[PDB]
Design a protein around this ligand. Structure first.
Ligand SMILES: CC(=O)N[C@H]1[C@@H]2OC[C@@H](O2)[C@@H](O)[C@@H]1O[C@H](C)C(=O)O
Ligand SMILES: CC(=O)N[C@H]1[C@@H]2OC[C@@H](O2)[C@@H](O)[C@@H]1O[C@H](C)C(=O)O
Lengths: 362, 353
């Protein structure tokens, strides 16, 4: 059947919407991006830290988020010349405003009942909670999907997402799927260039490529306890943010802004490489998705730090890097409806396999 | 099949758990009450007003609430000698910590995914949101169930808050919240005398109704409104009463009359031809209130629901088990003429075990 996937990630630039065909395999039929207004982005970010009157504030933010998603679903279907009735379900991640696996909770907002009401399509949502409920991290959730797409018993491969945050799926033949967050992907580089130069992202990693890696700063950033931990682990804005970076910066004389940028690129390269190679030293292929796949300087640094492996963007495997996550969530809606597991216990640390999500019928 | 119903209401004394048999009709098979600890009750109440760090605080409260519910489900099933596999689903209301239909939102907590994980049973939950999403009040939700059981008569719940279902032959089901049931009388006696409720309405029966206070309390805009309407702790609370504010027992007597009058006047305004009023909730055993309801509605027979085969205390739990059955059968759970929603809607969300 046909499934919609709805993802809104860490960057908060806008919503990813995806149409997939799901039978024996997964086929991307269509994709649609809708920018998020500055107001909504800032209001979401304000909910990402503890604050006053959060229940009402989140309820009102969630309305606008859902109205925008429904709008985006309408636009995709019209542009593809198909009616809501031709889609079996929308797999909606919602929007993470808090991720505290160590306190046994994770918060994705996005009122799925309103989403079903506005789209007239069945909604499967809230995928992370049942994994956390089973003792797991609730993240990353793509591994099972990466496994469905790229699982091959000839070669050991890692499927790496570089978004705001980085995460990897380790597909070792004959062994259970493993994986975890590696740490910051684009989140720090975006925040640094936005703070200094007013731009949302560092195009092709060019500002970073114009500076010099500072070894002292790099070592102290890699000293964060998160990078040392192994096995199931997940992270978010709670750990890696701009105040976090500036605390490491305030201990030492003012450094050139482009050099801080260069260092942050290397932090992402090194934290990915070291955590990946620690878990799958026999890695032969690294398949890269998310925005980071088109960061030239990062894709080059990843190639230098993992010489034993072929580092390549996921587009030369038939899957556009930007749409992988949306597709995963459409696929999770299919998995829910078929009563098939969505998590990987050796990824999240959950007690066992679980059916993820909840069903809100149209 | 068999369904569990899980309700935790306004009073926050504890959780109602219900087992029903559902085929052509609804049969109560078993019921189980589990008290809520003082800590959890107070922590829930703290979330019923705006405050700091609510996301994390609610996540942690919800975890204790679910753990207690799972514990109560385990206890019921053991005591009834049946395994989790014999139950098709749990209908869980969760716990209302905010109800703002005018701002198009209502907040019931109670992590249904954790509930399915701990019980090993499928969970249907979050019943109010789809109705609010369709333009409705999201409350009251019992009317459709009251209609399935008792379908001219009014079916009246007196809990912390009062609500009525008006079952007029040949006409669509109507209904609304009438206002405070026991909530204010409980709050007043707990504030003055330290007791959780006014046993049989005896403290109230010992005082004199104050006409002046009564009139000013009935002057609240909510009592004047008609058609679909819902309320909660946001409107009727102890600071609300004290703003309008005499001997303490006289205030109690007045509060009993407020409940009697607001129920009577709103009921009779909507269904003047009412012949039978079937009363559920704790208020059904408040003697002085059940007498005052009989005085104010002479045209109607006012009777507790137990003499219709349904114990007053378990009606709500049964409604929510029934709503789980309705979800799974893809049948509507709201009444558009009750809630004001745009049309009939399948209520709730399914969290498979
Ligand atoms: C709590 C949360 O939303 N985590 C995100 C984040 O974004 C990337 C990474 O960190 C991953 O763990 C997850 O998202 C992707 C879609 C996932 O679950 O696979
Ligand atoms: C928002 C909310 O939880 N309302 C409750 C409350 O308690 C009684 C009454 O006011 C009713 O409107 C509702 O619960 C019952 C179970 C209902 O929806 O029918």
């Amino acid at each position: 059947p046909r499934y919609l996937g709805l993802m809104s990630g860490t960057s908060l630039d806008g919503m990813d919407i995806v149409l997939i065909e799901q039978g024996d395999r997964t086929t991307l039929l269509a994709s649609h991006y809708l920018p998020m207004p500055a107001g909504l982005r800032e209001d979401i970010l304000a909910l990402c830290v503890p604050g006053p009157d959060e229940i009402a504030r989140a309820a009102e933010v969630e309305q606008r988020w859902v109205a925008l998603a429904a709008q985006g679903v309408r636009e995709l279907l019209l542009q593809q010349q198909m009616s809501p009735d031709e889609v079996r379900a929308i797999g909606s991640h919602g929007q993470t405003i808090r991720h505290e696996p160590a306190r046994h909770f994770t918060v994705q907002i996005g009122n799925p009942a309103l989403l079903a009401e506005l789209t007239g399509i069945d909604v499967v949502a809230d995928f992370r909670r049942r994994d956390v409920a089973a003792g797991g991290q609730g993240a990353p959730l793509v591994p099972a999907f990466h496994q469905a797409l790229f699982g091959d018993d000839d070669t050991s491969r890692a499927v790496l997402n570089i978004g705001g945050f980085s995460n990897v799926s380790l597909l070792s033949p004959g062994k259970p799927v493993r994986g975890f967050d590696c740490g910051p992907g684009n989140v720090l580089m975006d925040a640094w260039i936005h703070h200094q130069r007013g731009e949302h992202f560092d195009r092709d990693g060019a500002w970073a490529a114009s500076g010099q890696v500072n070894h002292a700063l790099l070592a102290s950033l890699l000293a964060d306890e998160f990078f040392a931990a192994r096995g199931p682990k997940s992270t978010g804005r709670e750990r890696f943010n701009l105040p976090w970076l500036q605390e490491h910066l305030a201990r030492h004389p003012a450094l050139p802004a482009a050099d801080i940028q260069a260092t942050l690129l290397e932090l992402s390269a090194r934290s990915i490489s070291e955590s990946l190679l620690d878990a799958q030293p026999d890695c032969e292929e690294v398949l890269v998705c998310g925005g980071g796949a088109f960061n030239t300087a990062l894709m080059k640094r990843l190639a230098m730090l993992m010489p034993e492996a072929r580092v390549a963007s996921t587009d030369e495997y038939g899957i556009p890097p930007a749409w992988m996550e949306g597709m995963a969530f459409a696929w999770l809606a299919h998995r829910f409806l078929e009563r098939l597991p969505g998590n990987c216990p050796d990824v999240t640390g959950a007690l066992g396999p679980r059916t993820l999500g909840a069903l809100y019928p149209a």
